Structures are given as structure tokens and as C-alpha cells.
Design an enzyme around this catalytic site. Sequence first.
Site, short mmCIF file in Angstrom:
data_model
loop_
_atom_site.label_atom_id
_atom_site.label_comp_id
_atom_site.label_asym_id
_atom_site.label_seq_id
_atom_site.Cartn_x
_atom_site.Cartn_y
_atom_site.Cartn_z
N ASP C 83 2.66 -8.69 -0.97
CA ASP C 83 2.49 -9.11 -2.35
C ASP C 83 2.85 -8.03 -3.38
OD1 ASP C 83 0.28 -7.97 -1.09
OD2 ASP C 83 -0.98 -8.46 -2.80
N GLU C 153 -3.06 -7.62 -0.58
CA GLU C 153 -3.51 -6.24 -0.68
C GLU C 153 -4.15 -6.00 -2.03
OE1 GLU C 153 -3.08 -3.53 -2.50
OE2 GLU C 153 -3.23 -1.81 -1.18
N1 LIG Z 1 -2.97 -0.40 -4.19
C1 LIG Z 1 -2.59 -0.83 -5.52
C2 LIG Z 1 -3.14 -1.96 -6.08
C3 LIG Z 1 -2.75 -2.36 -7.34
C4 LIG Z 1 -1.81 -1.62 -8.04
N2 LIG Z 1 -1.39 -2.03 -9.37
O1 LIG Z 1 -0.95 -1.08 -10.32
O2 LIG Z 1 -1.41 -3.17 -9.65
C5 LIG Z 1 -1.25 -0.50 -7.48
C6 LIG Z 1 -1.65 -0.11 -6.22
C7 LIG Z 1 -1.03 1.13 -5.60
O3 LIG Z 1 -0.86 1.15 -4.36
O4 LIG Z 1 -0.68 2.09 -6.33
#
Ligand SMILES: Nc1ccc([N+](=O)[O-])cc1C(=O)O
Lengths: 212, 212, 420, 420
Positions: C83, C153
Amino acid sequence: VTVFAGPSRYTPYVPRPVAALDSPNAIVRMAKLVEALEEWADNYEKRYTREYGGGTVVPKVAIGAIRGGVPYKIYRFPELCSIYMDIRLNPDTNPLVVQREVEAVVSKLGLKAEVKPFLFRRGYEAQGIEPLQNALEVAHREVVGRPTERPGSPECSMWRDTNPYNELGIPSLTYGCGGGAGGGNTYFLVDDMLKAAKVYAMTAMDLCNRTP
Amino acid sequence: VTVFAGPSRYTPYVPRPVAALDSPNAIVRMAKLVEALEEWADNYEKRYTREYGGGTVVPKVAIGAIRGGVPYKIYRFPELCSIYMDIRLNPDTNPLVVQREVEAVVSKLGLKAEVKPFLFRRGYEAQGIEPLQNALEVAHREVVGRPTERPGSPECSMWRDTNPYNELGIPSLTYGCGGGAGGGNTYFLVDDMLKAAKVYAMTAMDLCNRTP
Amino acid sequence: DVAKVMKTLDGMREGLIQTAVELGSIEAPTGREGAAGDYVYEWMARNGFGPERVGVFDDRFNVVGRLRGTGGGASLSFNSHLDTIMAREDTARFADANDRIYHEAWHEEGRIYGYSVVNCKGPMACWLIAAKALKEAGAALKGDVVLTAVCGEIDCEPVDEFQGHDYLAEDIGARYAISHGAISDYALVAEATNFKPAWVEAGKVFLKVTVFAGPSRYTPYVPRPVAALDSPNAIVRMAKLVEALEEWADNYEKRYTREYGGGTVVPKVAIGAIRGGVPYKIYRFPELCSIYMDIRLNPDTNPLVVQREVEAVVSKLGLKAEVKPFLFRRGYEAQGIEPLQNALEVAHREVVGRPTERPGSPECSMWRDTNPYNELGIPSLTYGCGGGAGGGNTYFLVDDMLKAAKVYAMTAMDLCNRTP
Amino acid sequence: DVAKVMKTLDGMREGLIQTAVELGSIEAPTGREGAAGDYVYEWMARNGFGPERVGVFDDRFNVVGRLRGTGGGASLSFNSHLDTIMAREDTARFADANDRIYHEAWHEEGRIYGYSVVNCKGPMACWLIAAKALKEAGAALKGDVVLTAVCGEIDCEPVDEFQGHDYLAEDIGARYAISHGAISDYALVAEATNFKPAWVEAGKVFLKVTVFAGPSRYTPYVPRPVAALDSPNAIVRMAKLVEALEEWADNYEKRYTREYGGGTVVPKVAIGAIRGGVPYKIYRFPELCSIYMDIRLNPDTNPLVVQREVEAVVSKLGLKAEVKPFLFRRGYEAQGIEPLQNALEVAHREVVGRPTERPGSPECSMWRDTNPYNELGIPSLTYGCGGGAGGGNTYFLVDDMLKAAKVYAMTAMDLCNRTP
Ligand SMILES: Nc1ccc([N+](=O)[O-])cc1C(=O)O
Ligand SMILES: Nc1ccc([N+](=O)[O-])cc1C(=O)O
Ligand SMILES: Nc1ccc([N+](=O)[O-])cc1C(=O)O
Ligand SMILES: Nc1ccc([N+](=O)[O-])cc1C(=O)O
């Protein structure tokens, strides 16, 4: 556990006599491997029995299902047969070991098979349980009339939704009246159940008035 | 063949150690019953071999399928497990006998099982086959260049659609190029395929110009 | 061996870029990861990794495949998620919800562009390729390499009237794949850490703070003037409550910073959404208004505390409100991480050319799928190229991406040839 | 023992009647046997015979259940068919297609009325009850009693454009049930034979004789006068060919009558249907007309011969026609019948009171499901009360039906306790 054999042959061409362990029919080899696993299972519970504060864990094994070939085209025996095993773990056993163990049971018979795990859950012992245990105990003694005793091993060697709570740091223990369904008991006594309501109620009144 | 055992128990309560043949898990007794039946199968073909004008019928046995319990609820082992057997019959064996034999093999093990037949077909030897046999032979000798030889026992111990014809009084035999698929062969030689076409044709020209 | 695979990866430099863009172009917001999962499945099948679909739903599922090993060595799991953050129309959260960056990927120069590439097909492409390099170079490994591509995730969570298939995320994600067979001895979650590895991440608790006021009145009867905190209109009191919580939030991260082996966890707070009354019947102001707060937790904080903390902020204002939590997850520090840490470090020094440094606190204070592995006893840490999308970075350097694939490779060769 | 069961049967005489009418009332022409099979299945299930549905189609199937025995004895099969001859609207074959008799059953006096009871729920009712008596009287049997109720007994056969589920009959009928597990050492087919047992039945072959003429002409151009045999209208030549075949038919039965142990086979001929051209475009006479003939065969006649005979009848008139057979079944004489014949005979003498006599030629010259059992080596003969529906009788005497149930029961008690 999926075991491979072969090659498939139309029934009129099946070669006999052949040793079981060398059968082309995977159902036959599975018959042997099933008996091997049954002895390994006998020892598994003895070797992996562990004593914990919460109880004593006797983790047992069972072969829940089998299936090889399809019932509607049996003219050819199958080159593979599979069994589905239920192996319990004490809180301190890693499932990869047990897989490697069963992989071993297979290797010892000189069989070729695929041991692949399709489920893994962890078992827990409660930590920081004392406040609940104590609240529980005071109420039990008041209602039942005697001390609480260590539960039977099966009740500590199964799945109860305490594992999720504990997994997430909510100290949890399991307690209720009557005898276990897996045993399996078939009824409850209205008096016991009425007592159990008293104990739950009393436990709540004690504990809920303690500051965290 | 369905073998009965039990009673089912939640895995944390499964009792061990226990002898295979006394197992509560029906998959385990089936394991034993499979190995007994495999030896019975070894002998069945020898005893029921029968030589006929048409060929020598060596009837084999095979366990085409097995299934006990379901893969998506294995927490409880199954009180019954089933296997599906394919038993060939020479034209002169009454299937009720064979059932009783297999019924017997089960009784020798002290098992409780249900042996139930879900298919019965009859094999036949051609009667009045000669005209076609002869017509075929002349064509064969003319094209292949040598006499026809006795077929292998497997080719006379299977199911081919000659049985329906013979069943209804249309004299029938089977003949073609290449080696049996159940063998199993994977190809044809185009020259052989071309020869077979000539024989079919010549057989027709011969036989179809004779008055019945 | 190691040089054989290194040279091999340069053979697939284009393939590295192609798989990244090809993957990145697929529209795969949380709730629609299916098309991307399907793509990885075929890629995995096409390359002989023999994948499987593990999922709760037939259109939202994880893909698990593996590179079998000779036998008797530790097994290492490689993980990344299908995703992406932004839906095609997420006009609710972004001022320009139509920027090309949010929904596409492209090679414009020695870098790859796309939020969907940084998070997270760039890293997935990296190890997807490394498995390719190892298999194709016939490298020797005693242990399996497990290839786990997961869904959900990202931190989308059902709440209130949004339940079910469309809103689920991490519950049907990696923790599902693991709990259903995708287990190994160790696991390396590939995401952008700027080539700095971290083995701690933060939990979280989500609170729905609803504040009560009233009584509602038809606009012609609204009583004024009235003090903000005494307003009958719950949107008004909420405005006051929002400013208090913003300050509480400022201190929260400071009070709860904790140093771990895995990193230094700085747990932040944000008010993710607000809503009171309905936009289509505004003639009567609303008697209650709600906000949804996202509070990170360091691995040692109990969410019930935080609830009481936010409950306190409300009580101090003499407001009546309902603080109710609708999400709770735990953060973990890896235990027994050393073999992977070491295996990883050796490769890093060889390729990147210098020692590993402490990860930035943001990368240790979020949710990454290391927490599920660690929750289940698979020592896990996170490491990948580039800078964090939450940052937010908008590109990867094909050179960096290539290195990371090498590091993934070299680590696998080291660790998978060690006996557990 | 025998007296225990006999008194029991008098116990269920009303149940005997109720079962027949209830069964007789169900509309179950061939093609719709489904409702009746369901009735018997539940009836069988209700009484613990643990039935099973054996069929090609889920609405046309046979019901097989059995009364288990102690062990090591011969097993006996009881058979009857679910279907009835006349559909509710069969205006094509019957002058009064609405007679109450063709489609219902009722108890009007010591006799039960209904073509559906004579053929064939009266007999089925008999042994269904007999099985009940044995089980309920706890009689001792070493062998199983197999209860087979089948569909597609009646000679409906698919032809031309009438193919498939609706027109199939005996192919999916008893022979299916047997070939798929309803096997026994011996089998008794219960149908109305007038308390005379017969173990021979006849084959059959169906010919579609199509005669060609022509050329088509619009009526105003039709040429007359012309001899019949030279007519362009194919219906006219057929008129002549029908009379020739009728004379051939008179002789066929005489020439091919054969005497067998089981009976004397008198094989008849009939022209069951004709059709040339279509009723909704008659302005042009048709260039071809067809008839469908039902020719019975003694067990020793070759269907290929009879075709050549009829082909000949056509050639003698100098007609050009196409004789093609669209059904062929074989008739059998029972071999190894003695054990059932005797077991039957003893019971008969005890209940009926006199020795059994040779059956009427029609009853040995038809199709009965004994041919399928015999074909597959299960010795079978047919015996039941009353006179044949083809005759056709229209009722049964409740007394005779009760007797027939006594005989069935006694036959079972005898035969099932013999070791094979
Ligand atoms: N695990 C994550 C979950 C959300 C976001 N986001 O900015 O939406 C980033 C990460 C990441 O891996 O940096
Ligand atoms: N939690 C349980 C889960 C399964 C079963 N069972 O018998 O299958 C029993 C219990 C129980 O609580 O006794
Ligand atoms: N009649 C056959 C039926 C089945 C198979 N088979 O190998 O599956 C082969 C033959 C054959 O003709 O060889
Ligand atoms: N088996 C039969 C089939 C058909 C007919 N019929 O008259 O249409 C009668 C019988 C019979 O048993 O008498």
C-alpha cells in the site's frame, strides 16, 4: 506435512510388491510417517512440559486432518498426501524448532516431504498478575469456602483469550465454574454458576477500587 | 473404507501414549489399516490372475484417495477417516466377494469399519470375436510384416470401451499403435500411426465385405 | 561468492529501475493494495519464488514467497508493504491532491520519483531484485530467505461508522502473514532509514475526544455574547480544548523521550481529524464535537496512562468530554538482534564504506512492520535507502537503491550461512 | 419367527394403505420423479433405513437404503420404480387425458385405485412396509436387505430433438443405482404380475422409419391423380408403409415367440408415433414422414436382424426410406435363480396357499428392472400382486397387497439367512 512419492500409475500398472516406505502411493508412505510422528508426539509432551507460576504446561500434539488424492478420481494413486498437525507450544518454545524437529522425523525415515507451518501463535504467562490473583482469591475464599488450587495441566496447555490480553500487557487469568468442554464436560450446576457470579462481582468491587 | 475410532478430544486433552490400533484418532488406525490392505493387495493380483483366450488378466488394487477430518478445523482429531480403493476384477469375479475380503482384512485387525462399494463394472471376454480377429490379423501381417503377439497383462486388465460392446453382444477387441498411457508413454511415432491407419482400413475392407 | 552477486546486481540495474517504476505506477492506496499485490505475485511467480496469497480478503492480501536453501542455517525474512499513502482523491487532507508526485513514479534522472516509490516500492524493488541476484547467481545459502510483501502497513484504522473491508489496515497486514506461516529466524524490514538501521519503533494509541455542550438552538435564538469555554456550541468549546491539547502535546514528546538500544524514541502527538455537526444541516449548531488524536507511545508506556493524561487536560478546563480510545498497538525493541545487526553492519561497511550511525528519532518513533515480528519473537530491524516519506522525501537515487540491494544481498549470504 | 412378523403386518395394514395413496397421489410422471423420490427418501429416513440419493440429476434420482443384518449372510434387494406412466397433460396419447384414474389414488373399497398405484407405488408400498415389519419385529437376518427405489423405469427415450434431462429414463434409472453400489446377492423386482413370478423379460429396439417422397409443391400445383405409392406427399406413401408394417408386426410375434425357464416370451410390435410436416405450415405437403416403432426382442434376438427385416418390408414396396434404430436394450433370463425362486416359492405357498404358476406372456415380454440386475449378475425375478397396468388394471385389493407384503417379508427371512 506433505510427503512426495510417485510416479502416479493407472491402477492396472501399479507395481507390487513394494515396501511401504518405498511405495509410489504417497498415502502409503504417509501411513508410515504418521506412525513415526505419533511416537515423536508421545515424547514431545514429556520433553516440553514446563512448570510456570500460573500453572504447568503440558503441550500435546494431534494429527487433525489428512487428505491425499481426490475421492472422485481414484483410478490413479496420488504422488502426494498431506496431513495437518496441531502442535502446542509452551510459552518458551520457538515454532521453528518444532518444525525442524518434525523435519527431522521425516529425514530419519529417508522420506522426502515439505513441512510448512500455516499457523503460529504465542503462549504467555501473566506478569504483574498479583493484584487480580489476590482480589480473585479473597472472593473465592469467601464464596467457595476454601483456597484456590493449581489448575489441571490441560487448562494451562490450551488457547484461552488470556493470551491476547497478556500479549498486550493486560494481566489476565482464566477462571470460571464447571469442567472443561475439551474434556469434555456436558453441563453446569446452577449453584456453581451462581457462585461464579458472586466471585466475579466481588472481584470487581475490590480491584476496581485500587488505584493503578 | 471408513474406519471408526474416537472419541474426539481437544488437543490439550489427547491421551498418550496409546497403541496405533487402539488410537482414538481414526487417522492413526487408518494408517495401520492401510498397511494391512497393502499386503492384501499384493496377494490379490496373484490369486485372481486368470488366463483367457483374449489375454491374461492380472487385476490390481490401489488406494486412490484418503481423507479424514478437514484442513480448516484440526484442533480436534477426527473420529473417522476414509480411504477410496480401486479394485480391478477379472471377468469372473463377483464384487461382493472382494468386498467381503476387504471386510475380512479389517476384522483381522479388530477394527470397526464400514466397507461400502460405490462403483461396480464388469469386464468381458469377446465371444464370436473371430471374424474381426482374423480380419485384423491379415491386415496387420500385411502392413506390420509379422504376426500379432499376446498383449501385455496390463492392457487386458484395465477398463476399455470394449466392455460395453461385448456387454451388448457386439464382439469387440482393442488394437492401436504406441505403448499404453498408464505405462506411461508420452509420444507416438508418425510411421506407426500411419501403419495403424492402414490396418484399420484394410480390416474394414476385409470384414465389411463378409456377410454376417 | 560475494563478488559474484555484486557484479550480478549491476547486470540488473535497469531491472531494478523498471520494477520500481512499474510497481510505483500502480494505484495502491490502503484499501486498494490488491492490484499491486497481484503484480508482485506474478513477479514472484515469474522468477521461481513460488508465492502464496495470505489475506483476509481476496483483494487485500499479502504475498509470501521464498528462496529455498540447502538446509540448516538461519532464515531471514525480507519485508515491505504494498500500500501507499495517498488515494487518487484525497482532497480531504491535501491542499493540492492532484500533484503528479502523490500518484505516480518516473525516472527523470539518476533518481526515481514518487511518494509511492519512497513508500514503499523502492525498497521492495530493492530486495525483490536481491533475491533475484542471489538465485540467478546460484549463491550458497543454508537457510531460506522469506519474501514477504504485505498490505495495510499504513495507519488507517476503522472508527465509528467506518468499519470492515475498506478501512482495515495493519490488522490484516504483516502480523497476519506472520501468524499464518511467514516466519523466519530473523527479519529485515526494508524502508527508508537513510542507511541507518533501527531496531525500535513506537506503539500508538488513538483517542476520540468528544466534548459535550448545549443546548442546541435555531440560529435566530442563539444566545450571545457568551464566553468561549461556556459556549453552547460544542465546536466552540472544542476550539479551546484544541489549544490546550496542543500545548500538552508539546510537552508530551519531551517528557516521554526514551533512549533505547534500537534508537531514541521521541513520541509525538497530532490531531488527525475533527468533525462536529453535519455540513448539510447547519441551521442548528451541534451539541457535541469530536476530534481524533494520534498519540505515539514509546515501548514502555501504557496507553491507559495517556488516556488519563488527556482526560486531565479536559478536566482542567472544566469541560465535560468523553475520551475514548479506538486504537492501541505496542512498540518493541528487538531482542537477540545481534546476529542480524552484525550481519547487516558488515555488508554496510563494505558497500556504503563507513560505520552505521544512530537512526533519526523519527524513524524510531513510528510504526513499521518490525513491531509485529518482534512481537512474535522474530528479531527484526529496519534499514533501507533514502529519507523518510513522512519527511517527506519524494525520490530515491538509483545509485543508493542499488547499494541497498547489495547490502540486502550480502547480509543474506552472511546471516543465512550461520547456524541458529 | 415367521409368525411374529405376520401378526406385525396386520398391525400396519392402514399404514400400508396410507403409504400407497400418499405415494400414489404425488404427481410423478417420468421426468418429474423428483417429488416422489423425496417422499420415499424421507419415509425411508424416518424409519431408519438410512437412505441415500443416487442419481445423475438432483431432481431425478434413486433412493437406496438398507436394513442392516447381523453378518455373513446373503443380501437381498427389493426394487420398485418412482415414476408413473401418464403426465397430467398427456393429451397426445389419451382420449380423456383427465380421467381421475390417470393421476390420483384413493381408497374406495377394499381396493385402491390409480394407475400410479398399480404402476407402481402399490408394490413399492408393499415391500417398504415389509421392511418396516422386519425391523419393527426385530426379525433375525444375517444379511442386508437393500431397499432400492428408482427412477426412469418407464420406456421414455430421448430421440431427435428430444434429448437430455427431461427425456432420459432407464439410462439414469435402476442400472445407475446398481452400477453405483446398490448391489446384492439377489434381487426381487416388485411389480404387478398377478402373484406369478417370472425371471425372464424382453429386450427392445426402437426404429425411426423415415420415408422420402417429393418434390414439395404448393397445394394448387399438387399433381393428381397419382397412385398412393407414387405420391409426392410423403404422408401418403407412409400410409401404405404403415399397413405393410402392421402385417409384418402380426407375424413377428408369432415367429419370435420363445419359451424360457422364466417364462414364454411373446415379443410384440407397435407404431407409437408418427409425424410428418408441421401443423402451422401446411400449405406445402412434406417431402418426408417419420414413424417411431417399438419392437420388443426376446433375449436371443439381435437388433441388427430386426432392422434388416423392416428395411426389407420397405424395399418390397419399392419405397426409399431410412431405417435407423435409436434405442437398443437387451432382455435377459435369470441364471442362478434357484435360491430366490425357492425362497419365494415357499413363502407364496404359505400365504397364497397354492403353488406358483407360469406368468402371462406379456409380463415376460416387457421391460422390467430385472434386466439390469441380471445384466450385472444379480439373479432377479419379479413378483407382486394384481394385474399389469399395461393391461391395464386400475386397482389393487388391499388384501392382496397385504399378502404380497407377507411374501416379501418371508422371502427375506428365508433368503437372508443363507450363506453364499
Ligand atoms: N511507515 C510509514 C507509515 C506512514 C508514512 N506516511 O508518511 O504516511 C510513512 C511511513 C514510513 O515508512 O516512513
Ligand atoms: N477455549 C477452548 C477452545 C476449544 C475447545 N474445544 O473443546 O475444542 C475448548 C475450549 C475451552 O475453553 O474448553
Ligand atoms: N483406458 C485408459 C484409462 C485411463 C488411463 N490412464 O493412464 O489414465 C489409460 C487408459 C489406456 O487406455 O491406457
Ligand atoms: N414396467 C412397465 C412399463 C410400462 C408400462 N405401461 O403400461 O406403460 C407397464 C409396465 C408394467 O410393469 O406393467
